[PDB]
Design a protein around this ligand. Structure first.
Ligand SMILES: OB(O)c1ccccc1
Ligand SMILES: [Co+2]
Lengths: 203, 228
Protein backbone atom coordinates (compact mmCIF):
# COMPACT_ATOMS: atom_id res chain seq x y z
CA UNK A 1 0.00 0.00 0.00
CA UNK A 2 1.42 3.42 -0.92
CA UNK A 3 3.35 5.27 1.73
CA UNK A 4 5.05 8.43 0.47
CA UNK A 5 7.38 8.28 3.49
CA UNK A 6 8.87 4.90 2.59
CA UNK A 7 12.30 4.32 1.05
CA UNK A 8 12.73 2.05 -1.97
CA UNK A 9 12.94 -1.70 -1.40
CA UNK A 10 16.54 -1.61 -2.65
CA UNK A 11 17.54 1.05 -0.13
CA UNK A 12 15.77 -0.83 2.68
CA UNK A 13 17.59 -4.05 1.75
CA UNK A 14 20.92 -2.22 1.61
CA UNK A 15 20.48 -0.76 5.09
CA UNK A 16 19.21 -4.00 6.67
CA UNK A 17 22.07 -5.95 5.12
CA UNK A 18 24.70 -3.64 6.66
CA UNK A 19 23.03 -3.69 10.06
CA UNK A 20 22.73 -7.47 10.10
CA UNK A 21 26.32 -7.98 8.97
CA UNK A 22 27.48 -5.60 11.72
CA UNK A 23 25.49 -7.43 14.41
CA UNK A 24 26.68 -10.76 13.02
CA UNK A 25 30.30 -9.65 13.32
CA UNK A 26 29.78 -8.80 16.99
CA UNK A 27 28.04 -12.07 17.88
CA UNK A 28 30.80 -13.95 16.05
CA UNK A 29 33.42 -12.21 18.20
CA UNK A 30 31.45 -13.11 21.33
CA UNK A 31 31.85 -16.75 20.30
CA UNK A 32 28.09 -17.42 20.25
CA UNK A 33 27.42 -17.44 16.49
CA UNK A 34 29.35 -19.26 13.75
CA UNK A 35 28.98 -19.73 10.01
CA UNK A 36 28.29 -23.46 10.45
CA UNK A 37 25.53 -22.71 12.99
CA UNK A 38 23.89 -20.35 10.46
CA UNK A 39 24.18 -22.85 7.62
CA UNK A 40 22.72 -25.69 9.73
CA UNK A 41 19.60 -23.75 10.73
CA UNK A 42 19.02 -22.70 7.12
CA UNK A 43 19.52 -26.24 5.82
CA UNK A 44 16.98 -27.68 8.25
CA UNK A 45 14.20 -25.28 7.31
CA UNK A 46 15.00 -25.16 3.60
CA UNK A 47 15.29 -28.91 3.07
CA UNK A 48 14.27 -31.02 6.07
CA UNK A 49 11.29 -29.49 7.87
CA UNK A 50 8.30 -28.47 5.74
CA UNK A 51 4.59 -29.07 5.03
CA UNK A 52 5.25 -32.52 3.51
CA UNK A 53 5.51 -33.68 7.13
CA UNK A 54 2.08 -32.33 8.02
CA UNK A 55 0.78 -33.97 4.85
CA UNK A 56 1.96 -37.38 6.11
CA UNK A 57 0.02 -36.84 9.33
CA UNK A 58 -3.15 -35.81 7.48
CA UNK A 59 -3.19 -38.78 5.13
CA UNK A 60 -2.57 -41.21 8.01
CA UNK A 61 -5.55 -39.69 9.84
CA UNK A 62 -7.60 -39.98 6.65
CA UNK A 63 -6.78 -43.68 6.27
CA UNK A 64 -6.61 -44.74 9.93
CA UNK A 65 -9.55 -43.82 12.18
CA UNK A 66 -7.72 -44.94 15.33
CA UNK A 67 -4.74 -42.73 14.54
CA UNK A 68 -7.11 -39.84 13.76
CA UNK A 69 -8.63 -40.29 17.21
CA UNK A 70 -5.19 -40.16 18.82
CA UNK A 71 -4.24 -37.15 16.69
CA UNK A 72 -7.25 -35.13 17.83
CA UNK A 73 -6.71 -36.24 21.46
CA UNK A 74 -3.03 -35.26 21.68
CA UNK A 75 -1.43 -33.86 18.55
CA UNK A 76 2.11 -33.86 19.88
CA UNK A 77 2.06 -37.50 20.94
CA UNK A 78 0.35 -38.70 17.75
CA UNK A 79 2.80 -36.87 15.50
CA UNK A 80 5.69 -38.44 17.43
CA UNK A 81 4.45 -41.84 16.17
CA UNK A 82 5.63 -40.68 12.75
CA UNK A 83 8.91 -39.21 14.04
CA UNK A 84 7.50 -35.69 13.68
CA UNK A 85 7.84 -33.00 16.34
CA UNK A 86 10.14 -30.52 18.01
CA UNK A 87 10.74 -26.78 17.95
CA UNK A 88 7.52 -24.68 17.95
CA UNK A 89 5.41 -27.82 17.83
CA UNK A 90 5.98 -28.98 21.41
CA UNK A 91 2.26 -28.60 22.03
CA UNK A 92 0.12 -29.30 18.98
CA UNK A 93 -3.67 -29.40 18.89
CA UNK A 94 -5.22 -30.57 15.64
CA UNK A 95 -8.79 -29.54 14.78
CA UNK A 96 -11.01 -31.36 12.31
CA UNK A 97 -12.88 -29.76 9.42
CA UNK A 98 -16.33 -31.28 8.87
CA UNK A 99 -19.54 -30.59 6.94
CA UNK A 100 -20.59 -28.46 9.92
CA UNK A 101 -17.39 -26.69 10.94
CA UNK A 102 -14.50 -24.94 9.26
CA UNK A 103 -11.30 -24.06 11.16
CA UNK A 104 -8.70 -21.41 10.36
CA UNK A 105 -5.59 -20.53 12.39
CA UNK A 106 -3.82 -17.22 13.05
CA UNK A 107 -1.34 -15.59 15.38
CA UNK A 108 -2.76 -12.11 15.78
CA UNK A 109 -0.03 -11.06 18.24
CA UNK A 110 2.94 -12.19 16.11
CA UNK A 111 3.61 -15.12 13.81
CA UNK A 112 3.29 -18.37 15.76
CA UNK A 113 3.01 -21.44 13.59
CA UNK A 114 3.54 -25.20 13.95
CA UNK A 115 7.05 -25.49 12.49
CA UNK A 116 7.50 -29.26 12.88
CA UNK A 117 4.58 -30.08 10.58
CA UNK A 118 4.45 -27.01 8.30
CA UNK A 119 7.96 -25.57 8.39
CA UNK A 120 8.38 -21.81 8.64
CA UNK A 121 5.26 -19.79 7.76
CA UNK A 122 4.87 -17.92 4.48
CA UNK A 123 5.27 -14.18 4.81
CA UNK A 124 1.57 -13.34 4.39
CA UNK A 125 0.75 -15.37 7.51
CA UNK A 126 3.16 -13.23 9.54
CA UNK A 127 2.04 -9.89 8.12
CA UNK A 128 -0.55 -7.48 9.57
CA UNK A 129 -3.12 -7.77 6.76
CA UNK A 130 -4.05 -11.43 7.32
CA UNK A 131 -3.59 -11.27 11.08
CA UNK A 132 -5.79 -8.23 11.63
CA UNK A 133 -8.69 -9.31 9.45
CA UNK A 134 -9.10 -13.07 9.84
CA UNK A 135 -10.42 -12.86 13.44
CA UNK A 136 -12.92 -10.18 12.43
CA UNK A 137 -14.10 -11.09 8.91
CA UNK A 138 -12.96 -14.69 8.31
CA UNK A 139 -15.76 -15.58 5.86
CA UNK A 140 -15.11 -12.53 3.68
CA UNK A 141 -11.33 -12.97 3.88
CA UNK A 142 -11.42 -16.60 2.78
CA UNK A 143 -13.62 -15.65 -0.17
CA UNK A 144 -11.79 -12.54 -1.34
CA UNK A 145 -8.19 -13.59 -0.77
CA UNK A 146 -8.32 -17.37 -1.25
CA UNK A 147 -11.40 -17.85 -3.47
CA UNK A 148 -12.81 -20.12 -0.78
CA UNK A 149 -16.54 -19.72 -0.16
CA UNK A 150 -17.75 -21.02 3.19
CA UNK A 151 -21.58 -21.04 3.20
CA UNK A 152 -23.04 -18.66 5.84
CA UNK A 153 -24.82 -21.54 7.61
CA UNK A 154 -21.48 -23.25 8.22
CA UNK A 155 -19.63 -22.31 11.40
CA UNK A 156 -16.16 -20.82 11.09
CA UNK A 157 -13.89 -21.24 14.08
CA UNK A 158 -10.80 -19.01 14.14
CA UNK A 159 -7.99 -20.20 16.42
CA UNK A 160 -5.73 -17.41 17.67
CA UNK A 161 -2.43 -18.86 18.92
CA UNK A 162 -1.87 -16.65 21.95
CA UNK A 163 -0.02 -19.41 23.86
CA UNK A 164 2.50 -22.11 23.03
CA UNK A 165 -0.38 -24.35 21.95
CA UNK A 166 -0.05 -24.72 18.18
CA UNK A 167 -3.26 -25.27 16.24
CA UNK A 168 -3.24 -27.27 13.01
CA UNK A 169 -6.20 -27.95 10.73
CA UNK A 170 -7.05 -31.47 9.64
CA UNK A 171 -8.77 -30.78 6.32
CA UNK A 172 -11.66 -32.87 5.07
CA UNK A 173 -10.74 -35.67 2.68
CA UNK A 174 -11.80 -34.66 -0.86
CA UNK A 175 -14.57 -36.66 -2.51
CA UNK A 176 -13.57 -39.10 -5.24
CA UNK A 177 -10.53 -40.49 -3.44
CA UNK A 178 -11.88 -43.78 -2.08
CA UNK A 179 -9.12 -46.34 -1.67
CA UNK A 180 -6.33 -44.02 -2.82
CA UNK A 181 -2.84 -44.74 -1.49
CA UNK A 182 -1.35 -42.48 1.18
CA UNK A 183 1.13 -41.22 -1.43
CA UNK A 184 -1.69 -40.30 -3.83
CA UNK A 185 -3.70 -38.65 -1.07
CA UNK A 186 -0.70 -36.57 -0.02
CA UNK A 187 -0.75 -34.75 -3.37
CA UNK A 188 -4.05 -33.16 -2.28
CA UNK A 189 -2.74 -31.85 1.03
CA UNK A 190 -1.33 -28.33 0.99
CA UNK A 191 0.16 -26.04 3.59
CA UNK A 192 -2.89 -23.82 3.04
CA UNK A 193 -5.29 -26.67 3.83
CA UNK A 194 -3.58 -27.17 7.19
CA UNK A 195 -3.82 -23.44 8.00
CA UNK A 196 -7.50 -23.52 6.99
CA UNK A 197 -7.38 -20.79 4.33
CA UNK A 198 -8.08 -23.36 1.57
CA UNK A 199 -9.65 -26.82 1.49
CA UNK A 200 -7.56 -29.80 0.39
CA UNK A 201 -7.25 -30.03 -3.40
CA UNK A 202 -10.33 -31.33 -5.22
CA UNK A 203 -10.43 -34.16 -7.76
CA UNK B 1 1.51 -3.45 26.43
CA UNK B 2 -1.11 -1.88 24.15
CA UNK B 3 1.25 -1.86 21.18
CA UNK B 4 0.37 -1.68 17.49
CA UNK B 5 1.70 -5.29 17.12
CA UNK B 6 -1.65 -6.33 18.68
CA UNK B 7 -3.43 -6.13 15.33
CA UNK B 8 -6.41 -8.46 15.79
CA UNK B 9 -9.52 -6.57 14.72
CA UNK B 10 -7.68 -3.57 13.26
CA UNK B 11 -9.23 -2.23 10.05
CA UNK B 12 -7.49 -0.52 7.14
CA UNK B 13 -4.18 -2.39 7.07
CA UNK B 14 -4.76 -3.27 3.40
CA UNK B 15 -5.02 -6.31 1.11
CA UNK B 16 -2.89 -9.38 1.72
CA UNK B 17 0.35 -9.56 -0.24
CA UNK B 18 0.63 -13.20 -1.27
CA UNK B 19 2.96 -14.05 -4.14
CA UNK B 20 2.13 -17.30 -5.94
CA UNK B 21 5.29 -18.78 -4.49
CA UNK B 22 8.23 -17.62 -2.41
CA UNK B 23 11.48 -18.98 -0.98
CA UNK B 24 11.87 -19.79 2.71
CA UNK B 25 14.62 -17.16 2.87
CA UNK B 26 14.40 -14.15 0.56
CA UNK B 27 17.97 -12.95 1.17
CA UNK B 28 21.12 -14.14 2.93
CA UNK B 29 20.59 -11.67 5.78
CA UNK B 30 17.32 -13.46 6.60
CA UNK B 31 19.21 -16.72 7.14
CA UNK B 32 21.53 -14.88 9.50
CA UNK B 33 18.64 -13.25 11.39
CA UNK B 34 16.91 -16.63 11.72
CA UNK B 35 20.00 -18.46 13.05
CA UNK B 36 20.64 -15.65 15.54
CA UNK B 37 17.58 -16.86 17.46
CA UNK B 38 19.13 -20.05 18.89
CA UNK B 39 22.50 -18.23 19.18
CA UNK B 40 21.20 -15.38 21.36
CA UNK B 41 18.88 -17.70 23.27
CA UNK B 42 21.77 -20.01 24.22
CA UNK B 43 23.87 -16.97 25.18
CA UNK B 44 21.17 -15.76 27.56
CA UNK B 45 20.10 -12.57 25.74
CA UNK B 46 16.45 -13.51 26.22
CA UNK B 47 13.92 -16.29 26.48
CA UNK B 48 10.97 -16.63 24.12
CA UNK B 49 8.57 -14.34 25.97
CA UNK B 50 11.25 -11.65 26.31
CA UNK B 51 12.04 -12.06 22.60
CA UNK B 52 8.42 -11.22 21.78
CA UNK B 53 8.39 -8.22 24.12
CA UNK B 54 11.42 -6.71 22.34
CA UNK B 55 9.56 -6.84 19.02
CA UNK B 56 6.47 -5.31 20.67
CA UNK B 57 8.55 -2.25 21.60
CA UNK B 58 9.47 -1.43 17.98
CA UNK B 59 8.64 1.83 16.28
CA UNK B 60 5.07 1.10 15.08
CA UNK B 61 5.53 2.33 11.49
CA UNK B 62 8.75 0.33 11.19
CA UNK B 63 7.00 -2.74 12.63
CA UNK B 64 4.07 -2.52 10.25
CA UNK B 65 6.05 -2.35 7.01
CA UNK B 66 9.51 -3.88 7.60
CA UNK B 67 10.51 -7.34 6.38
CA UNK B 68 9.57 -9.85 9.08
CA UNK B 69 13.08 -10.93 10.07
CA UNK B 70 14.01 -7.30 10.68
CA UNK B 71 11.75 -7.62 13.76
CA UNK B 72 14.05 -10.36 15.03
CA UNK B 73 17.12 -8.15 14.53
CA UNK B 74 15.48 -5.35 16.54
CA UNK B 75 14.78 -7.61 19.51
CA UNK B 76 18.35 -9.03 19.48
CA UNK B 77 19.76 -5.53 19.63
CA UNK B 78 17.21 -4.50 22.26
CA UNK B 79 18.17 -7.34 24.57
CA UNK B 80 21.88 -7.07 23.74
CA UNK B 81 21.76 -3.49 25.03
CA UNK B 82 19.53 -4.42 27.99
CA UNK B 83 21.99 -7.10 29.15
CA UNK B 84 25.12 -5.10 28.31
CA UNK B 85 26.24 -7.72 25.80
CA UNK B 86 25.97 -5.33 22.81
CA UNK B 87 27.64 -1.91 22.77
CA UNK B 88 25.43 0.35 20.64
CA UNK B 89 28.21 2.73 19.63
CA UNK B 90 30.30 -0.17 18.36
CA UNK B 91 27.30 -1.61 16.49
CA UNK B 92 26.73 1.74 14.79
CA UNK B 93 30.40 2.04 13.82
CA UNK B 94 30.42 -1.48 12.37
CA UNK B 95 27.18 -0.81 10.52
CA UNK B 96 28.75 2.18 8.77
CA UNK B 97 31.83 0.09 7.99
CA UNK B 98 29.75 -2.60 6.29
CA UNK B 99 27.68 0.07 4.51
CA UNK B 100 30.87 1.33 2.90
CA UNK B 101 32.49 -2.10 2.59
CA UNK B 102 29.66 -4.59 2.00
CA UNK B 103 31.99 -7.38 0.86
CA UNK B 104 34.47 -6.93 3.72
CA UNK B 105 35.02 -10.16 5.66
CA UNK B 106 33.40 -11.27 8.87
CA UNK B 107 35.74 -11.71 11.86
CA UNK B 108 37.90 -14.83 11.97
CA UNK B 109 36.41 -17.43 14.29
CA UNK B 110 36.52 -21.09 15.24
CA UNK B 111 33.61 -23.38 14.48
CA UNK B 112 31.99 -24.97 17.52
CA UNK B 113 30.49 -28.48 17.53
CA UNK B 114 28.43 -27.62 20.62
CA UNK B 115 26.50 -24.97 18.65
CA UNK B 116 25.52 -27.52 16.00
CA UNK B 117 24.53 -29.93 18.76
CA UNK B 118 22.43 -27.16 20.33
CA UNK B 119 20.64 -26.45 17.05
CA UNK B 120 19.88 -30.11 16.34
CA UNK B 121 18.61 -30.73 19.89
CA UNK B 122 16.43 -27.62 19.91
CA UNK B 123 14.95 -28.33 16.48
CA UNK B 124 14.15 -32.00 16.91
CA UNK B 125 13.72 -32.09 20.70
CA UNK B 126 11.89 -28.80 21.14
CA UNK B 127 11.82 -26.29 23.97
CA UNK B 128 8.68 -27.33 25.87
CA UNK B 129 7.04 -24.60 27.95
CA UNK B 130 4.77 -26.98 29.88
CA UNK B 131 5.35 -27.14 33.64
CA UNK B 132 3.98 -28.91 36.71
CA UNK B 133 2.46 -26.74 39.43
CA UNK B 134 1.20 -27.48 42.94
CA UNK B 135 -2.25 -25.94 42.49
CA UNK B 136 -5.17 -27.64 40.67
CA UNK B 137 -6.88 -25.84 37.76
CA UNK B 138 -9.36 -23.21 38.92
CA UNK B 139 -11.60 -23.61 35.85
CA UNK B 140 -13.04 -26.44 33.77
CA UNK B 141 -14.71 -27.13 30.42
CA UNK B 142 -18.06 -25.37 30.15
CA UNK B 143 -17.28 -22.61 32.64
CA UNK B 144 -18.41 -19.17 31.50
CA UNK B 145 -15.63 -16.68 32.17
CA UNK B 146 -14.73 -13.05 31.58
CA UNK B 147 -11.35 -11.88 30.29
CA UNK B 148 -9.48 -9.30 32.38
CA UNK B 149 -9.57 -5.58 31.52
CA UNK B 150 -6.05 -5.15 32.93
CA UNK B 151 -3.70 -3.24 30.61
CA UNK B 152 -0.10 -3.89 31.72
CA UNK B 153 2.64 -1.80 30.12
CA UNK B 154 4.92 -4.85 30.18
CA UNK B 155 4.65 -8.05 28.17
CA UNK B 156 1.40 -10.03 28.25
CA UNK B 157 -0.74 -12.07 25.84
CA UNK B 158 -3.84 -9.95 26.32
CA UNK B 159 -5.09 -8.98 22.85
CA UNK B 160 -7.19 -5.85 23.13
CA UNK B 161 -10.05 -7.40 21.14
CA UNK B 162 -10.76 -10.01 23.88
CA UNK B 163 -10.42 -7.80 26.97
CA UNK B 164 -13.54 -7.64 29.12
CA UNK B 165 -15.21 -10.21 26.86
CA UNK B 166 -17.21 -13.22 28.04
CA UNK B 167 -16.50 -16.69 26.71
CA UNK B 168 -16.67 -20.40 27.51
CA UNK B 169 -13.78 -22.60 28.63
CA UNK B 170 -13.20 -25.21 25.93
CA UNK B 171 -10.14 -27.06 27.24
CA UNK B 172 -7.65 -27.06 30.09
CA UNK B 173 -4.14 -27.77 28.79
CA UNK B 174 -2.15 -27.98 32.00
CA UNK B 175 0.25 -25.33 33.26
CA UNK B 176 2.78 -23.37 31.17
CA UNK B 177 5.32 -20.57 31.45
CA UNK B 178 3.42 -17.36 32.22
CA UNK B 179 4.19 -14.55 29.75
CA UNK B 180 3.32 -11.70 32.14
CA UNK B 181 6.24 -12.72 34.32
CA UNK B 182 8.60 -14.41 31.84
CA UNK B 183 8.50 -11.68 29.19
CA UNK B 184 9.36 -9.06 31.79
CA UNK B 185 12.37 -10.85 33.28
CA UNK B 186 10.40 -12.06 36.28
CA UNK B 187 10.73 -15.80 35.62
CA UNK B 188 8.54 -18.70 34.56
CA UNK B 189 5.90 -18.55 37.36
CA UNK B 190 3.77 -21.11 35.50
CA UNK B 191 -0.02 -20.88 35.36
CA UNK B 192 -2.77 -23.16 34.15
CA UNK B 193 -3.72 -22.61 30.53
CA UNK B 194 -7.16 -22.71 28.90
CA UNK B 195 -8.64 -22.31 25.45
CA UNK B 196 -11.71 -20.07 25.65
CA UNK B 197 -14.38 -19.64 22.95
CA UNK B 198 -15.69 -16.14 22.18
CA UNK B 199 -18.56 -15.64 19.74
CA UNK B 200 -18.09 -13.16 16.89
CA UNK B 201 -21.04 -11.16 18.19
CA UNK B 202 -19.47 -10.97 21.65
CA UNK B 203 -16.25 -9.68 20.09
CA UNK B 204 -17.55 -7.42 17.31
CA UNK B 205 -21.09 -6.49 18.35
CA UNK B 206 -24.70 -7.18 17.23
CA UNK B 207 -23.60 -7.02 13.60
CA UNK B 208 -21.29 -9.97 14.13
CA UNK B 209 -21.28 -13.21 12.14
CA UNK B 210 -23.85 -15.28 14.04
CA UNK B 211 -22.01 -18.41 12.87
CA UNK B 212 -18.40 -17.70 13.83
CA UNK B 213 -16.33 -17.88 17.01
CA UNK B 214 -12.74 -17.15 17.98
CA UNK B 215 -10.76 -19.50 20.20
CA UNK B 216 -8.15 -17.74 22.30
CA UNK B 217 -5.77 -19.13 24.91
CA UNK B 218 -5.97 -17.68 28.41
CA UNK B 219 -3.64 -18.23 31.35
CA UNK B 220 -5.53 -18.60 34.62
CA UNK B 221 -5.10 -15.03 35.93
CA UNK B 222 -6.60 -13.68 32.68
CA UNK B 223 -10.06 -15.04 33.41
CA UNK B 224 -12.61 -15.14 36.21
CA UNK B 225 -15.83 -17.01 36.63
CA UNK B 226 -19.17 -15.81 35.42
CA UNK B 227 -21.04 -19.16 35.58
CA UNK B 228 -19.92 -22.77 36.10
O1 LIG C 1 5.25 -15.84 16.38
B1 LIG C 1 5.96 -16.82 17.27
O2 LIG C 1 5.02 -17.45 18.26
C1 LIG C 1 7.47 -17.07 17.26
C2 LIG C 1 7.93 -18.23 17.82
C3 LIG C 1 9.28 -18.47 17.86
C4 LIG C 1 10.15 -17.58 17.37
C5 LIG C 1 9.70 -16.45 16.82
C6 LIG C 1 8.36 -16.14 16.76
CO1 LIG D 1 3.25 -15.52 16.55
Amino acid sequence: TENILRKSDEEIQKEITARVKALESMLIEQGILTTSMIDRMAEIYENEVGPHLGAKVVVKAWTDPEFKKRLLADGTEACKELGIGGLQGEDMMWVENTDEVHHVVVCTLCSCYPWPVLGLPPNWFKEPQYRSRVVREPRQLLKEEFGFEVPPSKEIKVWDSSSEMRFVVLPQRPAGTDGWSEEELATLVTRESMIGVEPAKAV
Amino acid sequence: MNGVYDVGGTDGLGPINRPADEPVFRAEWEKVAFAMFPATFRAGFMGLDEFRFGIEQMNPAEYLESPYYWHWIRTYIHHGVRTGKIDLEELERRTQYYRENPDAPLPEHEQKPELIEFVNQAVYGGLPASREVDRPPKFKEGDVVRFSTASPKGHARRARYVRGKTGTVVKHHGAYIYPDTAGNGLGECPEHLYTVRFTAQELWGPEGDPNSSVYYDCWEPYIELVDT
